[PDB]
Design an enzyme around this catalytic site. Structure first.
Site, PDB file in Angstrom:
ATOM      1  CG  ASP A  43      -2.028   1.054   1.090  1.00 41.67           C
ATOM      2  OD1 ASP A  43      -1.858   2.048   1.821  1.00 41.67           O
ATOM      3  OD2 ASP A  43      -2.933   0.972   0.221  1.00 41.67           O
ATOM      4  CE1 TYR A  92      -4.343   7.969   0.194  1.00 35.60           C
ATOM      5  CE2 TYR A  92      -4.108   7.927   2.598  1.00 35.60           C
ATOM      6  CZ  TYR A  92      -4.380   7.282   1.411  1.00 35.60           C
ATOM      7  OH  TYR A  92      -4.688   5.935   1.452  1.00 35.60           O
ATOM      8  CG  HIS A 117      -6.276  -2.762   0.129  1.00 34.60           C
ATOM      9  ND1 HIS A 117      -5.446  -2.240  -0.854  1.00 34.60           N
ATOM     10  CD2 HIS A 117      -5.885  -2.199   1.307  1.00 34.60           C
ATOM     11  CE1 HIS A 117      -4.635  -1.359  -0.291  1.00 34.60           C
ATOM     12  NE2 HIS A 117      -4.885  -1.303   1.008  1.00 34.60           N
TER      13      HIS A 117
HETATM   14  C1  LIG Z   1      -0.229   5.218  -3.031  1.00 31.65           C
HETATM   15  C2  LIG Z   1      -1.650   4.822  -2.829  1.00 31.65           C
HETATM   16  C3  LIG Z   1      -2.267   5.837  -1.937  1.00 31.65           C
HETATM   17  N1  LIG Z   1      -3.553   5.261  -1.432  1.00 31.65           N
HETATM   18  C4  LIG Z   1      -3.423   3.998  -1.266  1.00 31.65           C
HETATM   19  N2  LIG Z   1      -4.357   3.111  -0.824  1.00 31.65           N
HETATM   20  C5  LIG Z   1      -5.110   3.432   0.360  1.00 31.65           C
HETATM   21  C6  LIG Z   1      -6.145   2.344   0.522  1.00 31.65           C
HETATM   22  C7  LIG Z   1      -7.274   2.759   1.417  1.00 31.65           C
HETATM   23  C8  LIG Z   1      -7.395   2.201   2.654  1.00 31.65           C
HETATM   24  C9  LIG Z   1      -8.444   2.592   3.456  1.00 31.65           C
HETATM   25  C10 LIG Z   1      -9.400   3.517   3.068  1.00 31.65           C
HETATM   26  C11 LIG Z   1      -9.285   4.074   1.830  1.00 31.65           C
HETATM   27  C12 LIG Z   1      -8.223   3.679   1.027  1.00 31.65           C
HETATM   28  S1  LIG Z   1      -1.833   3.425  -1.690  1.00 31.65           S
END
Ligand SMILES: C[C@@H]1CN=C(NCCc2ccccc2)S1
Ligand SMILES: C[C@@H]1CN=C(NCCc2ccccc2)S1
Ligand SMILES: [Mg+2]
Ligand SMILES: [Mg+2]
Lengths: 546, 546
Positions: free
Chosen positions: B334, B465, B523
């Site tokens: 991830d 993020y 996931h």
């Molecule tokens: C580089 C990419 C950035 N976001 C990624 N996945 C998050 C997954 C996720 C987990 C939980 C909630 C929403 C999304 S990895």
């Protein structure tokens, strides 16, 4: 005036430099002089090498571009390159040839000791070759000694571009006239000089240090042998393992390779190994420097029997189990020395090799209670002083600074006598309120011990001495065994408690025992003679534990 | 009724047994049948072997006594032993031949899962041979699965002496009729039977487990494939390294060998690797399972820019520097997957090999701002939801249990849609107050995450993020490079956010990329399909990182 010093890597902090392989390769192979340098510099500011040096491409992508440049240069000089001519080969070999230039590093260290900010500024590359680890090790070893490492390929700028010198200044928070910059490339010094920096053109090291000594006013050449690198507690990895519900062990950990567990003595700390930890890691080992049970950040339960050897050893085995280590090398000093011998006799499958500083291995006498054995040697009278719970705790806790400053003394510095301590009424009854500082330690280092011992005091530590009978009964179980794993005994000439001659019969029990002996060394072996300890341990590790 | 189960080591938990080499050696060498067994048992209760088994002497001292017994037996049988006949040789070979009997271990594990106390009771020796490590590894691997390991040579008593069974009972805090004891030696079972224990004479494993199943009433044979071993947080070594004044990183550490740094995703923990940590250590690696910055016991400063990739990566390099590691293998999932690709592109000299679960490597597009790039894919709408500081923190912190129970779901279990989250007003707006528990996790495991996330909440995690532009500018610096170190990409069929097809162009940037693919895997790859993850990682580690 001067407050900062900046060193190049190639040809300044590490030798032989790598264009020195462009030159030598031409000679060795009888190619047109300067041909390999022409290829290397082809295209100048926008040729392949600058893109490398700026981090645009990696070393592995550059290799075939250098190949092409070599082909082009040799076509134009109307010559052929030899069959099996290999750029990868040449550079692999150049890059492993290149070692730390020890006198230059020691000058940088010394200038940093007198307050200079130090930095490495180098044109270098992103190294993705199969053998890249070698360079990663060199850079690790060098950079830990400096305030800043600035790499062309990380900052996207290269010497001699003027922006990299502005970036250097801004990193140093210094103005140019406060900075000396050393480089083996004159074109690289020019922009530093333009800004008014002191520059030194490095050909042979000695002359460069001569210039460096003159301009900074500090002695750098012909200086005495410096101490090994020490550890700063807040820069270490601190580890913690619970071995049973009320007992966690703390250790500091540095390095990769075969696990080497260091076990300190009374009343000490992991930090007593501070001079060994970086050298042994550097030597290819994974060091684990314990707080033994009772000390520092490890648990210190109050009960006497929590400190008998059987319990201490079982817990050290659990500590290996929880870390997933099938064995470690055990190296002990003082009480820790006694413990590692018992690890070797009770858990030889878990001990890759065993070494003791000062503490000899002496088999329990099954015909004499250990009290009597202790009473037969006037130098051990302090052990009776320690028996009665609370008596030695109150004297040792009463003024921690005075405690460690009185204990930690070189053999020439008014060592306490261990002589009729009970009769005298205590260990310090005849020592000053404010002892002078031993040459072995700084005032800062004493205050580290003081601060460690404020957490639990001396109860746990003293309890190591309070299980004489219980340890004697356990030891008698091992009277039919020999120690037949690799084993090293290191005696100290002037330890007047753990005397070298008390080890004289060890070969009856440990027939393949190896030895080292340190002259003019008192009881606090690791900080008394750190350099000699390190050389004797690494030599024995490399031959016997590897 | 039955509450405890006791297993022998030789011939029960490990096979082939070692007297089975006494037998086979006689056959192979055409010696008188039983000759080697006679030598081995010579002198009975006071012969050399019993002294071995009781810890009186070590294996190395015993070897020449067995030699002598062999000589005596062969003199009396009027035969010669062959030239080069070697007891050390025979036993070295027998002891390395001997492996864990997997079905018997899995029965013991299962009985312990349903509440049995389990123990190993074995006659064994103090092993000081040059090759002792092999046995140390086996015993480590076996013993971690049991409540007690009782070794004849540590307790000074041996089967069949009756005192060892009394000592066993007292260790178990059980009465004999609550105990089943398995052994391949009938004379060893007799005293257990005399006390009224259920005993099982083990010849072939299946029949023994048949008896064991009948007598305990639990299913042990033909049972489904069990999960890999997990980690109990309070049994691990916890490490802590300060990478800069306000920032310490926590990790858990298990194993020896090449360093392997595991980097978890959002919103996760070191504990997300719980199924990989013991298998990778077991496989010959030194695992470091991080709390990434922002999480668990690592620091979580509030500022957004503390979480841009440049900073995160530099800190991970410092973390290696402070531990004295010149490289590690980086394995990420991830967000952690995205990070290890940048470690490979910016610090290839520090990365021995790189692997990502789920997260593909996609080069920054220098012609499109990352906001627009994100807006071009409906499945990434949750990333816009995350931008505005405080909005997602309040929803995710509001009920931690509901947060993790909603997130951590197998692909067949009502996974949240990442579909128009902003429009909907949140991630959980359409999920229940009390979700059911996924088959992937226990209620205890959810509460571990809940407790971790009570320290710092979701601010630091969400900040990963919040540096889209800053990471895009840094990534554009690497657009001329390729990744040419060993590299593994592992796709998950049913991860509907990080879809396998988003990795399809990776070979343009990573030409020697290796792949694995896990079908029917959502996931949360490490806990969705732990067994398959482990097999794919170990196979790639052993071929590419070793
Ligand atoms: C580089 C990419 C950035 N976001 C990624 N996945 C998050 C997954 C996720 C987990 C939980 C909630 C929403 C999304 S990895
Ligand atoms: C196994 C032996 C037990 N006592 C040992 N030395 C303590 C040295 C000492 C240090 C400080 C004060 C007094 C004595 S090691
Ligand atoms: Mg140079
Ligand atoms: Mg057996």
């Amino acid at each position: 005036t001067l407050r900062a010093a900046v060193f190049d890597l190639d040809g300044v902090l590490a030798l032989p430099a790598v264009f020195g392989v462009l030159g030598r390769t031409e000679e060795a192979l009888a190619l047109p002089r300067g041909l390999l340098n022409d290829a290397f510099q082809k295209g100048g500011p926008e040729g392949a090498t600058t893109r490398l040096m700026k981090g645009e491409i990696t070393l592995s992508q550059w290799i075939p571009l250098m190949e092409e440049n070599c082909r082009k240069c040799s076509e134009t000089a109307k010559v052929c390159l030899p069959k099996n001519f290999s750029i990868k080969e040449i550079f692999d070999k150049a890059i492993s040839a290149r070692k730390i230039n020890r006198p230059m590093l020691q000058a940088a260290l010394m200038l940093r000791k007198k307050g200079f900010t130090t930095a490495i500024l180098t044109n270098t590359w992103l190294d993705d070759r199969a053998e890249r680890d070698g360079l990663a090790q060199l850079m690790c070893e060098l950079k830990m000694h400096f305030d800043f490492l600035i790499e062309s390929c990380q900052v996207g700028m290269v010497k001699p571009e003027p922006q990299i010198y502005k970036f250097l200044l801004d990193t140093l928070k210094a103005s140019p006239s406060e900075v000396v910059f050393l480089d083996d490339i004159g074109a690289n010094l020019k922009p530093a000089r333009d800004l008014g920096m002191v520059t030194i053109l490095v050909q042979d090291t000695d002359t460069a240090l001569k210039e460096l000594e003159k301009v900074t006013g500090i002695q750098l050449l012909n200086t005495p042998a410096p101490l090994p690198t020490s550890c700063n507690p807040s820069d270490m990895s601190h580890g913690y393992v619970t071995v049973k519900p009320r007992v966690r062990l703390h250790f500091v950990e540095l390095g990769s390779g075969p696990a080497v567990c260091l076990c300190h003595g009374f009343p000490e700390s992991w930090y007593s190994w501070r001079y060994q930890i970086p050298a042994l890691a550097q030597a290819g080992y994974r060091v684990l420097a314990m707080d033994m049970k009772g000390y520092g950040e490890s648990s210190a339960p109050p009960e006497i029997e929590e400190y008998c050897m059987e319990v201490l050893c079982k817990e050290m085995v659990t500590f290996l189990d929880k870390l997933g280590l099938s064995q470690a090398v055990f190296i002990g000093h003082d009480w820790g020395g006694m413990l590692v011998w018992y690890m070797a006799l009770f858990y030889p499958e878990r001990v890759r090799a065993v070494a003791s500083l000062n503490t000899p291995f002496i088999p329990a006498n099954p015909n004499m209670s250990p009290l009597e054995s202790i009473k037969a040697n006037p130098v051990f009278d302090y052990q009776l002083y320690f028996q009665e719970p609370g008596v030695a705790e109150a004297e040792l806790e009463q003024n921690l600074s005075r405690t460690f400053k009185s204990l930690f003394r070189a053999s020439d510095e008014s060592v306490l006598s261990m002589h009729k301590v009970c009769e005298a009424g205590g260990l310090f009854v005849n020592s000053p309120e404010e002892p002078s500082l031993s040459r072995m330690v700084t005032e800062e280092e004493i205050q580290f011990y003081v601060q460690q011992f404020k957490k639990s005091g001396f109860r746990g530590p003293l309890n190591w001495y309070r299980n004489m009978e219980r340890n004697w009964k356990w030891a008698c179980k091992s009277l039919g065994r020999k120690i037949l794993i690799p084993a090293l005994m290191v005696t100290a000439e002037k330890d007047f408690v753990l005397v070298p001659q008390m080890s004289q019969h060890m070969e009856d029990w440990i027939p393949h025992l190896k030895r080292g002996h340190i002259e003019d060394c008192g009881h606090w072996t690791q900080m008394d003679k750190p350099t000699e300890v390190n050389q004797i341990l690494i030599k024995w590790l490399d031959s016997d534990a590897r």
